[PDB]
Structures are given as structure tokens and as C-alpha cells.
Write a structure and sequence with these properties.
part of a larger assembly; 10 chains; A mainly alpha (about 55); C alpha+beta (about 240); D alpha/beta (about 150); F mainly beta (about 120); H alpha+beta (about 100); D: about 30% strand; H: alpha+beta; four-stranded mixed β-sheet; binds zinc ion; DNA-directed RNA polymerase II subunit RPB1 (chain J); DNA-directed RNA polymerase II subunit RPB2 (chain E); zinc-finger (chain F); Rpa12/Rpb9/Rpc10/TFS (chain F); DNA-directed RNA polymerase activity (chain F)
Chain lengths: ~55, ~55, ~240, ~150, ~70, ~120, ~90, ~100, ~100, ~150
């Protein structure tokens, strides 16, 4: 239905805003990675986690 | 792909397929989906080729 | 609607499938994750554009793992057994001073890292300081069929003028050019060792060359033509030797 | 949403100065002498031949019926002259080598006493190298000293 | 007008003008034709000369060389 | 580290300890050319390398179409037309700090808000 | 006349290609159409003739392959080399 | 018996274009005081650039173990290069890219 | 792919001859201390020399490449960061029209 | 871990600090060699403070190095215990000095009883690679998990 399509569009849009925010915080060097991984690994885990969360 | 800018970490350019199979897919998404399909076929082929030797 | 594009042999429609191979005359660098003393390899498959089909390939090896000191550079040469350092080859190419060698390898005086890693090669290049002693060194190292030294120094020089880098050209006097190209390959090897450039990708489709009927029939007709000439000359020598018509 | 296959009907229904002259030296002097070039490789800026002192000397240092391969002309004439020259006194040493690539187009504009110039085509070009500055060597002594 | 931007469908026409010129299997025809045109003369001319060296006791020689090749 | 070469010999100047006057010197072992020392430093390893991140910066970097475009102003000339790119030093632990390159004064100002 | 140019995989490293002409070149929605990218990039040096040309001969027979998964396009591309038909008239 | 004649003679080395060089295989140079040209005979005038101002360690000799007669000419004074109705020369340069084989 | 073709190879001699007419300095005359910002020119992997003006030269080779003088099968790349300009006219490359 | 010391983060930090391999190269930002003939007096104007404190026949050549304070934190270390480790490594042949934790610049200097530079450079390799500050061998990246 229409409203469901709009809820999916907003669900993906919120995840896109999250990936953009984590992207800006990563480009500004304001996010410290956890123990065991580097900045790029934690960033990719956050982006992939947000995208899979929005898809689910 | 040579259709995006350099040093782009946006999720859309990194492989996220926000479209669905009902409305079709874009070329830059169909290419990555083809990569995933070929990877699936190769992985299944290797898993079978080793599964036979393990079975023997 | 017959598209054509195939051959007919013995009533059978034969098709020559397009073959795929790698390109040549391009400097490549790779890493070695094995416990081998070589850390990076600078391979370059040199061959002419037309004729002979050369297979000789030059290799510039970097010894010593990361962390350990005394990381010298030694490049192999065709027909020469053991590997020869790059600076000694520079002495054999006519360049005796070392400041000119560092001027050909590294093109930036402000950078101290590459010049710093050049030091051991400048030490072994201090051990052998003469061009004549370098030509006699490569003459005594590889190819022992010369026996005489006076013919092995000129023979080694002819190796450096002909077999060394078949591309560009094979004439005498092009040692300065090949010195600049060699310093360029060393600059790419050490520049890849400083983690400033990634390992050269071989899966790039632009670095791959396809072969249709043209190249295949060029190799085939080339070898068959060589055999034809050799056989014709064999008949000539038989004719003049056996004294007949 | 359908393939438009009626395009045939649509297309069918739609359609202060100083001037000084130049001269060419007669070819007799060109037949007498061949002009070569000099380039030094010692980094020192000056190095004239007057400071090279005297006496300056530049001198060049049974089978049956079988098969031969072949070879051409100019390459053979350049291959037979494999003896490089040297300039010394009686001490400084300069040994030159061929340049080959720097042949191409090189015209000499020799300046005489008058403002005019004399143009001479360059035959070859050589790179002279100052040899034996330090004065040392060894051969087998270096081959055994490099084995440590 | 004549200086107006093209559309997406119009591009198909271009593709037509491509396949009318090349064809679906033009690479084999162009490569083979270039082989027959230039590669034959290049292979024949790159190593045609062979000489026999004859000795007598006065020296003697013989030579055979291949020129322009002919195809039927 | 930033060593000199000999005169005429052009060989590298190995360090020589002067025990008479007790001072550093620079020698050439091929010849007898020994010059004084203007610094006691000889060798610097520098393990953690941070240089090379801004490598390959040319005068014609503003005419690259593959490079992106941003609207952030320069702290010097205040020009919002610039081209940004990350570090050129390729390594695993290399941060993703952007490098802003103004298209007017050719200044390289980064976007790091923690350390500048 | 300088209106179309060949590009290999080496020159492709130094060019910026656009997909649709009348969708990415000019500067600025029904929910049934697919979502596309933006036109923030200005330095477009080249443009794709048509994306459907990236497929081979066997995949070209597929109707609406975008709405179908890739391994089915591969299986159909494999079954298209053995179906019954008329190869020639002679 | 090698003898240096003078070496005091000053010679200028010139890198000419191929058609005029092969033609030389006479004009009048006009020295404009830091820009100098050349008025050939009817025909073009040519600006010659001061390629290398300081040009030491370079000389010129002639020739009349096997010692031969060696004579010294003069020192090299300036490194130069001739620079270039230019549309006809540009068309000839475009025209040289049309060589074919039978 | 439906519009992909294979190159056939041309002749690099007219290009090398055409480069030296616009001031392409030969390789043997190169000094990195007198011309550090010179762009290296590569023809089929062979380093023939450098040039101190790759902008106007590249524009000239591109304009003459689009007019039909140079064979369109020749692919020329200008790597800025690497400071190189590769020229590929060898047979075997796969290209596509755009 | 033990049932008695369960659900404790500090104890697990002590165990991790007791088994995780650490080396001197881990903490090292850079090193540099100096010619300083007089054993006691130092030409370097900064280190004079150290000279004033850590003092109150030997090699004229100086080996010096600087450590990352962040490395001294993430991997808990003391300039003292480090100097202890080196002193009990090479024993008495190599004299040792190290800067204080209070110093905003962490400094370590060492000397010995042909050229001295080559000897120092050998000792540099031994220092970076062959010294393990703490932890048992072949243990890395200990991860806390609940
Ligand atoms: Zn010296
Ligand atoms: Zn600015």
C-alpha cells in the first residue's frame, strides 16, 4: 500500500541520515574505534549494521 | 565505478540497493547484484567440489 | 542471415576462440607474504612489438624484511646466474658516481626516506667503484663460455646493449636512456616499499590483451615460415655439398 | 509501454637590432674534417682545455659448405670503430663515449671575427668522462674482498 | 530545433547506426583481414634473407630472399 | 638523514669522529675531502610515519574532473570553491581526515577539529 | 566530427561517465518508478550510450532482467544456447 | 701530434626543424637586444631562443691504439634552438601522419 | 558485451615523431634538478622523454584524436597523481563507444 | 576467570596486562643518534633538564629515542621499569637514562663503554625487536567479553 511504501521510504531515509552522520563524524576524526578493529572496520560495521537494520 | 566521484563513502555508491524487484534496479546496482550472484555460484561449486572429496 | 566469421576445414565449421593473456612492457610490483628474504618483486616482461617473440623478463628484487636493517636491492639479469645489485649495473651502464645514481632513482631531494634506504646499495656500490671492474664483474659472474676475459667484458657489454631491456631498442649507445628507465623501476619498487602505493593489480581488464586469429596466425605463420626458410637452406647446402643440379 | 515499430510511416510523413648574414662553408673543409661535439662529466663548471695543460693528446686506444647470418652498413661501420679515444697530457685523463641519440639535427654557428657566422652540420657527439681521479683498483683483490 | 538536446529513446538510433557499420561479429573479420593484409608481408619481409657460404681453394656465396607475397 | 656528497667524488660523506679536537666531521673514504659538522645529528629512523598522506599535490590539481567539489570556505582567502581529498598515505591505520585544497591560493587546510 | 569516442578499460580510469543523458546532464515523483541517484557531479566527460548494452548476446533475450535475480539471468543465458529454432534458411 | 688550434672561437649549437635542416644538408640573423630572429633567403623569419645561457664543459673539435690527426676548434658559447605562413607548416605536419603501405 | 570490440594495433612512429615537434625533450637530456615538474611521456611503456607543458600538448593530441587523424583505437591516459601519460596503441585491448 | 573474581573489569585488566605481549618498539615514536663526545655534558639544550636531574670512559656516541605517552597509557608502562628492563638486559656495558612521566616529551638516552654509529645501530635493532616489556609470547589483542 501507499502508506507502507512511504514508511519504507522514511525507514531507509533515516538510515541514510545515520550513515551520513557517522560519515561526517568519521571524516572529522571524532570517532575512536573499539579494541580489536580500526576506524574503517568499525565504520563499515556501523554502516552495514544500519543498512541491514533498515532493510529488516 | 567510473560513474561516481572519488573518495565516495556514501552507502548508495558502496553497494546498497535501495530499489526493489517490483520497480526494477539501476545499472550500478544490477552490476553488484551480478557480482554477488556469480560469487554465490562459485562458492557453491567449490563447496561441492570439496564436499565430494570429504565424502570419499 | 549467415554471420560468417569462422573457418571450414574438412567440411567442419571450426571457430578460433579468443585467447586471453597479460600485457608486457609495463613495470609491475608485488609483495611476498612468504618467509622468503625478498619482500617486493618488480617484474617487467620485456618484448619487442613485432618479431622473434621475446620471453626474457627483468626482475628487480628487494631483500630484507620489514623491521630488519641492511635491506639491499639486487636485480637479476638474463644469461647471468646469480643476482647483481642495481648500483653495480649502474656502474656497468657508464654511470660511476653515486650522487648521479641517487639523482636518477629518486627525483626529489627533499625526501630523505628513499635516499636513506639507498644507503646499503651505495655501500656495495662503494665496494666496486669502476665501470671496467663492473663489466668484468658481470663478465665473471654469469655466462662462463667466454673463457677469455677480453671477450667476456665486451661480450657482457654487448649483453647490456642487446639482451638487457629488449624493448626501446637494441643499438649501442642507449645506456643513458636505459639507466633512466632502470632508475624509474627502482623508484617504483622503493616507492611501493614506502607504503605510498598499493600492490599492482593484475585483475584490471585494461592490462589484459586478447588474441584473435591475427596474433595466433602471426605466431603460427612466423614459425612455419622460419621452418620453411631453414629447410630451403638445408636443400641449398645439400645441393652445393653433394655437387648436383 | 510498447515497442514503436511504425516509425517508417512517421519518418515518411515527417520528412637596437644588429643584422648579420649567414653563410655555408664550402664542402671542401667538410670533406677534410668531421665535426664532433664534446661534453664533460665531472660536474666542475670550468674545466677548460687551457687548464687541461699540455701536451694535450686525443688518440683512440676443415669445414665444408656452411651458413652465414647477415648485417648492414652504417651499423657495421659503427661496430668496427669500437675503440674510444682519450685525451691526456704526459696527469689528467678524459675518455669519451658515443652519444648516438643526440645526432638528429645539430647545426653549429661558429662565430668569427666579424658579426657573421659560419654554419657547420654536426657529424656526431661524444660524452667525455674524467677518468682516474682517485687512482685505485684491484680486480681479483676486490672479488675476494667482496666475499666477506 | 536542430540544436536541441537528444532524449533517451533517440539513443537507440545511434546503436542502429553502429550495428549497420560493424556487425555482430566484426572483430574477427577486421582482425583476420588486417592479418592477411599486413601480417603476411611483415612475416615474409622480417626474415626472408638466407645465404649459403661456399668455400673453394676462391670464396663464393649464394643468396635467396622473399619479396611481395601473393594471395589467391 | 639529509647527508651531503663529496666534491669531485660526489660520494656520500660518512661520519668521522675527530678525536684530536673532539668534534664530528664528514669524510669521503675515496679521497681526502673532510668537511666540518654543522650538527651532531646523524641518523633518525622515525618509526611511526605520518608523512606521505598529502602526497602528489600539483599546481594543476584544480583541473581534475574526477576530483569532487565542496562549498566550505578557506580560512585564508575565504574561497568556497575548493577540492578535497583524503590522505595519500595508503595504510591500514590511516585516518579518513579530509584534505581541503583551495582553488585560489592553493592552500591545503584540513577538516580535523581535534588537532590542527 | 568528434561526437563519439572509443574507451577501453585503461582510459576508463580517468573519465566520468553518465548513465542516462536527459536524467543526469540537466540540473534540477511517482512511487512506481525506481529510485535513482543525483546529479551533484558536474565534470561529466563522457556519457553512456545505453545501459542495456552492457549485457551479452544471450542475456539480451531476457525480458525485464532488472526485475529478475542474477543467477536466473545466468541460467537462462545458459539455456539460450540449446533451444530449438531455425538457425539459417539454407 | 694533436694540437689545439685556438679553442678561443665561440660556437653556437642549434636544434633546427627537420625540413630546413635536411635542406641545409643562406640567411641573415637579426640580433635584437634578448630576442633574435633569422631572415632566410627567398624565406621565413625565425626566433631563436636562448636555450641554455651558461654552457661550460662543452667544446668542439675536428679530426683530419691508432692515433689520428686531431685538431681543436672552439668553445661552445650558447645553447640555442630555432623556433618557427605557419598554417602551411602545420598542414604539412598534419600531412606527415598519412603514411601507408601497399 | 554487445558493443565491445577488440583493438587491432596501429603505428606509434608518427605519434613519437609528432611529439618532438612541440618541444618534447628527449630522455637522455633530462635533468631532475633543472626540470623537476616535467611530465613524463610514455608510448607503449617506452619512456621517450618528458615535457614541461602537458596541458596544451594533451589538448592538442585530444583535438587531433577526435578529428580522425589518430586512430580512435589508440587509448591515451593521463595519470595526474602518478604524473604520467600512458599511450596504448597495441592490439588486444577491448574498448566500447561512448 | 575465577568464580571469586567474576564480573570485575579491573581484575581482567590486570590479567590482560599480565599476559598480553608488549614490546619496546610498540611505544616508540622515533629514535635518533647524536654525536656527543663528553659523557656528562650534552649539547642538546632541552635534555639539559634531564642532565640536571638523572645524573645527581664511555662512548662519545649517543643513542636517543622518544616514546608515545598514549602507548605508555594503553599499554601500562613506567619509564623506570623500562630502563630497568634494558639495564637487566644488556647489563653494565650500556649506560642508560630515561625521562620522567612528568616530562611532556618522553626521552631515553644510552651510551657504551671503527665508528660507534654502526654499533649503536645494531643495538637499535636489538632494542626494538628483542625486548618484550611485559606479557608472555604469542598473545595479542585480548578482548573483554561478558
Ligand atoms: Zn671524494
Ligand atoms: Zn584558499
Amino acid at each position: 500500500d501507499g502508506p507502507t511504501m512511504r514508511e519504507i521510504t522514511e525507514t531507509i531515509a533515516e538510515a541514510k541520515k545515520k550513515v551520513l552522520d557517522v560519515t561526517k563524524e568519521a571524516q572529522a576524526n571524532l570517532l575512536t574505534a573499539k579494541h580489536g578493529m580500526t576506524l574503517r572496520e568499525s565504520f563499515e560495521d556501523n554502516v552495514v549494521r544500519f543498512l541491514n537494520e533498515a532493510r529488516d | 565505478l567510473p560513474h561516481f566521484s572519488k573518495d565516495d563513502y556514501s552507502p548508495e555508491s558502496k553497494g546498497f540497493v535501495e530499489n526493489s524487484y517490483l520497480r526494477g534496479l539501476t545499472p550500478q546496482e544490477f552490476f553488484f547484484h551480478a557480482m554477488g550472484g556469480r560469487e554465490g555460484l562459485i562458492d557453491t561449486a567449490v563447496k561441492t567440489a570439496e564436499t565430494g572429496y570429504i565424502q570419499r | 542471415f549467415d554471420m560468417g566469421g569462422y573457418f571450414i576445414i574438412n567440411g567442419s565449421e571450426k571457430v578460433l576462440i579468443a585467447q586471453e593473456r597479460s600485457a608486457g612492457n609495463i613495470v609491475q610490483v608485488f609483495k611476498k607474504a612468504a618467509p622468503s628474504p625478498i619482500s617486493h618483486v618488480a617484474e617487467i616482461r620485456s618484448a619487442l612489438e613485432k618479431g622473434s617473440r621475446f620471453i626474457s623478463t627483468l626482475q628487480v628484487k628487494l631483500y630484507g624484511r620489514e623491521g630488519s636493517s641492511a635491506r639491499t636491492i639486487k636485480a637479476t639479469l638474463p644469461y647471468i646466474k646469480q643476482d647483481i645489485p642495481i648500483v653495480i649495473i649502474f656502474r656497468a651502464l657508464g654511470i660511476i658516481p653515486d650522487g648521479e645514481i641517487l639523482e636518477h632513482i629518486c627525483y626529489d631531494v627533499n625526501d630523505w626516506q628513499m635516499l636513506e634506504m639507498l644507503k646499503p646499495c651505495v655501500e656495495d656500490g662503494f665496494v666496486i667503484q669502476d665501470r671496467e671492474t663492473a663489466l668484468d664483474f658481470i663478465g665473471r659472474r654469469g655466462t662462463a663460455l667466454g673463457i677469455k676475459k677480453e671477450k667476456r667484458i665486451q661480450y657482457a657489454k654487448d649483453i647490456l646493449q642487446k639482451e638487457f631491456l629488449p624493448h626501446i631498442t637494441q643499438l649501442e649507445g642507449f645506456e643513458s636512456r636505459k639507466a633512466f628507465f632502470l632508475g624509474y623501476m627502482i623508484n617504483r619498487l622503493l616507492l611501493c616499499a614506502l607504503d605510498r602505493k598499493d600492490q599492482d593489480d593484475r585483475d584490471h581488464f585494461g592490462k589484459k590483451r586478447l588474441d584473435l586469429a591475427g596474433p595466433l596466425l602471426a605466431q603460427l605463420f612466423k614459425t612455419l615460415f622460419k621452418k620453411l626458410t631453414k629447410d630451403i637452406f638445408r636443400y641449398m647446402q645439400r645441393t652445393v655439398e653433394e655437387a648436383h643440379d | 509501454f510498447i515497442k514503436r515499430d511504425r516509425m517508417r510511416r512517421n519518418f515518411l510523413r515527417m520528412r637596437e637590432y644588429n643584422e648579420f648574414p649567414l653563410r655555408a662553408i664550402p664542402k671542401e673543409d667538410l670533406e677534410n674534417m668531421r665535426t664532433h661535439l664534446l661534453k664533460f662529466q665531472s660536474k666542475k663548471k670550468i674545466n677548460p682545455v687551457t687548464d687541461f695543460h699540455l701536451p694535450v693528446r686525443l688518440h683512440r686506444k676443415r669445414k665444408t659448405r656452411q651458413l652465414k647470418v647477415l648485417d648492414e652498413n652504417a651499423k657495421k661501420l659503427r661496430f668496427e670503430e669500437f675503440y674510444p679515444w682519450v685525451m691526456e697530457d704526459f696527469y689528467n685523463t678524459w675518455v669519451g663515449s658515443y652519444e648516438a641519440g643526440n645526432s638528429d639535427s645539430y647545426v653549429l654557428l661558429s662565430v668569427e671575427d666579424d658579426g657573421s657566422f659560419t654554419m657547420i652540420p654536426a657529424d656526431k657527439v661524444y660524452k667525455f668522462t674524467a677518468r682516474n681521479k682517485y687512482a685505485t683498483l684491484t680486480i681479483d683483490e676486490a672479488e675476494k674482498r667482496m666475499d666477506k | 530545433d536542430e540544436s536541441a538536446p537528444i532524449t533517451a529513446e533517440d539513443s537507440w538510433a545511434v546503436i542502429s547506426a553502429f550495428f549497420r557499420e560493424k556487425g555482430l561479429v566484426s572483430q574477427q573479420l577486421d582482425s583476420f583481414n588486417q592479418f592477411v593484409d599486413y601480417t603476411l608481408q611483415d612475416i615474409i619481409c622480417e626474415d626472408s634473407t638466407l645465404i649459403l657460404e661456399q668455400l673453394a681453394q676462391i670464396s663464393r656465396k649464394y643468396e635467396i630472399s622473399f619479396g611481395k607475397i601473393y594471395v589467391t | 638523514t639529509t647527508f651531503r656528497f663529496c666534491r669531485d667524488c660526489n660520494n656520500m660523506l660518512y661520519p668521522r669522529e675527530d678525536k684530536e679536537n673532539n668534534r664530528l666531521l664528514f669524510e669521503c673514504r675515496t679521497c681526502s675531502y673532510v668537511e666540518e659538522a654543522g650538527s651532531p645529528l646523524v641518523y633518525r629512523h622515525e618509526l611511526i610515519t605520518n608523512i606521505g598522506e598529502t602526497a602528489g599535490v600539483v599546481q594543476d590539481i584544480g583541473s581534475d574532473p574526477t576530483l569532487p567539489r565542496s562549498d566550505r570556505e578557506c580560512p585564508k582567502c575565504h574561497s568556497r570553491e575548493n577540492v578535497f581529498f583524503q590522505s595519500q598515505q595508503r595504510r591500514k591505520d590511516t585516518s579518513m581526515v579530509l584534505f581541503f585544497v583551495c582553488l585560489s591560493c592553493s592552500h591545503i587546510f584540513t577538516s580535523d577539529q581535534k588537532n590542527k | 566530427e568528434g561526437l563519439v569516442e572509443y574507451i577501453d578499460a585503461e582510459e576508463e580510469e580517468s573519465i566520468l561517465i553518465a548513465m542516462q543523458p536527459e536524467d543526469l546532464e540537466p540540473a534540477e515523483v511517482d512511487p512506481a518508478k525506481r529510485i535513482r541517484v543525483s546529479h551533484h557531479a558536474t565534470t561529466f566527460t563522457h556519457c553512456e550510450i545505453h545501459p542495456s548494452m552492457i549485457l551479452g548476446v544471450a542475456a539480451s533475450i531476457i525480458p525485464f532482467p532488472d526485475h529478475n535475480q542474477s543467477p536466473r539471468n545466468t541460467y537462462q543465458s545458459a539455456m539460450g544456447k540449446q533451444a530449438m529454432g531455425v538457425f539459417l534458411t539454407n | 701530434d694533436l694540437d689545439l688550434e685556438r679553442s678561443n672561437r665561440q660556437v653556437w649549437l642549434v636544434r633546427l626543424p627537420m625540413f630546413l635542416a635536411e635542406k641545409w644538408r643562406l640567411g641573415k640573423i637579426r640580433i635584437n637586444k634578448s630576442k633574435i630572429t633569422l631572415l632566410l633567403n627567398e624565406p621565413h623569419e625565425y626566433d631563436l631562443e636562448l636555450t641554455k645561457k651558461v654552457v661550460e664543459n662543452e667544446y668542439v673539435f675536428t679530426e683530419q691504439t691508432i692515433p689520428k690527426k686531431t685538431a681543436i676548434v672552439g668553445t661552445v658559447c650558447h645553447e640555442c634552438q630555432v623556433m618557427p605562413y605557419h598554417k602551411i607548416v602545420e598542414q604539412r605536419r598534419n600531412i606527415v601522419k598519412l603514411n601507408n603501405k601497399e | 558485451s554487445l558493443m565491445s570490440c577488440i583493438s587491432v594495433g596501429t603505428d606509434p612512429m608518427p605519434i613519437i615523431t609528432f611529439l618532438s615537434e612541440w618541444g618534447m625533450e628527449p630522455l637522455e637530456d633530462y635533468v631532475p634538478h633543472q626540470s623537476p615538474d616535467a611530465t613524463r611521456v610514455f608510448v607503449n611503456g617506452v619512456w621517450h622523454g618528458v615535457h614541461r607543458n602537458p596541458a596544451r600538448l594533451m589538448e592538442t593530441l585530444r583535438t587531433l584524436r577526435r578529428k580522425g587523424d589518430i586512430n580512435p583505437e589508440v587509448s591515451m591516459i593521463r595519470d595526474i597523481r602518478e604524473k604520467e601519460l600512458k599511450i596504448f596503441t597495441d592490439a588486444g585491448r577491448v574498448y566500447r563507444p561512448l | 576467570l575465577e568464580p571469586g573474581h567474576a564480573a570485575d573489569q579491573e581484575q581482567a585488566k590486570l590479567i590482560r596486562s599480565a599476559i598480553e605481549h608488549t614490546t619496546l618498539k610498540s611505544v616508540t615514536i622515533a629514535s635518533e643518534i647524536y654525536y656527543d663526545p663528553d659523557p656528562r655534558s650534552t649539547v642538546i639544550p632541552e635534555d639539559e633538564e634531564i642532565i640536571q636531574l638523572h645524573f645527581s670512559q664511555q662512548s662519545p656516541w649517543l643513542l636517543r629515542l622518544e616514546l608515545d605517552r598514549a602507548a605508555m597509557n594503553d599499554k601500562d608502562l613506567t619509564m623506570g621499569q623500562v630502563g630497568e628492563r634494558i639495564k637487566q638486559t644488556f647489563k653494565n656495558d650500556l649506560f642508560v637514562i630515561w625521562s620522567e612521566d612528568n616530562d611532556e616529551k618522553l626521552i631515553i638516552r644510552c651510551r657504551v663503554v671503527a665508528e660507534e654509529d654502526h654499533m649503536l645501530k645494531k643495538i637499535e635493532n636489538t632494542m626494538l625487536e628483542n625486548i618484550t616489556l611485559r606479557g608472555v609470547e604469542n598473545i595479542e589483542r585480548v578482548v573483554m567479553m561478558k
